[PDB]
Design an enzyme around this catalytic site. Sequence first.
Site, PDB file in Angstrom:
ATOM      1  N   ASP A  19      15.207   6.391 -32.623  1.00  0.00           N
ATOM      2  CA  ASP A  19      16.273   6.945 -31.797  1.00  0.00           C
ATOM      3  C   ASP A  19      15.800   7.851 -30.662  1.00  0.00           C
ATOM      4  OD1 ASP A  19      19.496   8.526 -32.657  1.00  0.00           O
ATOM      5  OD2 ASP A  19      18.674   7.804 -30.741  1.00  0.00           O
ATOM      6  N   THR A  20      15.735   7.268 -29.466  1.00  0.00           N
ATOM      7  CA  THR A  20      15.312   7.982 -28.267  1.00  0.00           C
ATOM      8  C   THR A  20      16.303   9.065 -27.841  1.00  0.00           C
ATOM      9  OG1 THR A  20      16.319   6.324 -26.787  1.00  0.00           O
ATOM     10  CG2 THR A  20      13.994   6.009 -27.484  1.00  0.00           C
ATOM     11  N   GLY A  21      17.531   8.988 -28.354  1.00  0.00           N
ATOM     12  CA  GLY A  21      18.547   9.996 -28.075  1.00  0.00           C
ATOM     13  C   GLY A  21      18.541  11.220 -28.989  1.00  0.00           C
TER      14      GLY A  21
HETATM   15  C1  LIG Z   1      23.501  14.490 -28.059  1.00  0.00           C
HETATM   16  C2  LIG Z   1      22.926  13.103 -27.926  1.00  0.00           C
HETATM   17  C3  LIG Z   1      23.198  12.192 -29.125  1.00  0.00           C
HETATM   18  C4  LIG Z   1      24.694  11.900 -29.297  1.00  0.00           C
HETATM   19  C5  LIG Z   1      22.545  12.792 -30.375  1.00  0.00           C
HETATM   20  N1  LIG Z   1      22.691  11.895 -31.550  1.00  0.00           N
HETATM   21  C6  LIG Z   1      21.709  10.788 -31.556  1.00  0.00           C
HETATM   22  C7  LIG Z   1      22.448   9.465 -31.330  1.00  0.00           C
HETATM   23  O1  LIG Z   1      21.511   8.410 -31.087  1.00  0.00           O
HETATM   24  C8  LIG Z   1      23.363   9.052 -32.475  1.00  0.00           C
HETATM   25  C9  LIG Z   1      22.650   8.554 -33.743  1.00  0.00           C
HETATM   26  C10 LIG Z   1      23.704   8.171 -34.774  1.00  0.00           C
HETATM   27  C11 LIG Z   1      23.936   6.833 -35.075  1.00  0.00           C
HETATM   28  C12 LIG Z   1      24.904   6.477 -35.995  1.00  0.00           C
HETATM   29  C13 LIG Z   1      25.648   7.452 -36.628  1.00  0.00           C
HETATM   30  C14 LIG Z   1      25.433   8.785 -36.332  1.00  0.00           C
HETATM   31  C15 LIG Z   1      24.450   9.142 -35.417  1.00  0.00           C
HETATM   32  N2  LIG Z   1      24.207   8.009 -31.958  1.00  0.00           N
HETATM   33  C16 LIG Z   1      25.509   8.120 -31.708  1.00  0.00           C
HETATM   34  O2  LIG Z   1      26.225   9.096 -31.866  1.00  0.00           O
HETATM   35  O3  LIG Z   1      26.057   6.892 -31.204  1.00  0.00           O
HETATM   36  C17 LIG Z   1      27.464   6.778 -31.078  1.00  0.00           C
HETATM   37  C18 LIG Z   1      27.662   5.973 -29.812  1.00  0.00           C
HETATM   38  O4  LIG Z   1      27.465   4.616 -30.230  1.00  0.00           O
HETATM   39  C19 LIG Z   1      27.863   4.496 -31.599  1.00  0.00           C
HETATM   40  O5  LIG Z   1      26.857   3.850 -32.380  1.00  0.00           O
HETATM   41  C20 LIG Z   1      26.306   4.747 -33.359  1.00  0.00           C
HETATM   42  C21 LIG Z   1      27.322   5.870 -33.501  1.00  0.00           C
HETATM   43  C22 LIG Z   1      28.043   5.892 -32.160  1.00  0.00           C
HETATM   44  S1  LIG Z   1      22.729  12.726 -32.939  1.00  0.00           S
HETATM   45  O6  LIG Z   1      22.603  11.813 -34.028  1.00  0.00           O
HETATM   46  O7  LIG Z   1      24.026  13.366 -32.951  1.00  0.00           O
HETATM   47  C23 LIG Z   1      21.523  13.827 -33.000  1.00  0.00           C
HETATM   48  C24 LIG Z   1      20.266  13.529 -33.546  1.00  0.00           C
HETATM   49  C25 LIG Z   1      19.226  14.475 -33.552  1.00  0.00           C
HETATM   50  C26 LIG Z   1      19.434  15.755 -33.035  1.00  0.00           C
HETATM   51  O8  LIG Z   1      18.408  16.678 -33.047  1.00  0.00           O
HETATM   52  C27 LIG Z   1      18.512  17.940 -32.368  1.00  0.00           C
HETATM   53  C28 LIG Z   1      20.689  16.064 -32.496  1.00  0.00           C
HETATM   54  C29 LIG Z   1      21.707  15.107 -32.486  1.00  0.00           C
END
Ligand SMILES: CC[C@H](C)CN(C[C@@H](O)[C@H](Cc1ccccc1)NC(=O)O[C@H]1CO[C@H]2OCC[C@H]21)S(=O)(=O)c1ccc(OC)cc1
Lengths: 99, 99
Positions: free
Chosen positions: A25-27
Amino acid sequence: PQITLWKRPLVTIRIGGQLKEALLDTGADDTVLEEMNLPGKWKPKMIGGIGGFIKVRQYDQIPIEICGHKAIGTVLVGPTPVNIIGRNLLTQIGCTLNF
Amino acid sequence: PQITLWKRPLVTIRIGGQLKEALLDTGADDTVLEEMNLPGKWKPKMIGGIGGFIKVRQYDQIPIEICGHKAIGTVLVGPTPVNIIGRNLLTQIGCTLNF
Ligand SMILES: CC[C@H](C)CN(C[C@@H](O)[C@H](Cc1ccccc1)NC(=O)O[C@H]1CO[C@H]2OCC[C@H]21)S(=O)(=O)c1ccc(OC)cc1
């Protein structure tokens, strides 16, 4: 290897006896793992994403193997719905985005 | 380009003739942008992240130029902590993970 993004980039990781599937996860700045009872000292932390914040336990210098590549660093443990390999470890296994 | 991950992979996007900064986010299935106006029909939808669920507006078939590469696809608009480019558009611009 090269991983396309047609599907979720899930890979096998190892942290202790536990093999788990985790998202490359690059995000994610940090690595966040599903609830597990790791040994060692930790510190409380809150991390935020879509939907709000969750409370996690920060463990430092935890060895983790990600697709046969060795890494060691900070892992956050808490009620995440998915195991997330963040940039802190992605750099250690040599991971880049390319287009 | 090749993008390493010691820093957040932030890129400039162009959408509706506006420039924004967005995060290349391989852990996101969907592309989610902060509150903004876009033209055309939208549908109410809900999506879930690490912290729970949010309400978004779904706009279909929206052109976005991402770091000079053209995509046309679904964009969700709502209370995300940061603009994120998810796999639905990362695939369109030929983005892979490599290590
Ligand atoms: C602030 C940027 C971003 C939203 C951060 N997220 C990483 C995401 O990659 C997250 C990773 C994620 C993936 C699945 C479920 C929860 C989190 N994906 C996510 O929310 O994606 C949403 C948009 O598309 C959909 O597909 C997946 C969920 C929806 S995170 O999981 O909340 C996160 C991870 C690590 C962190 O460390 C400080 C802080 C936050």
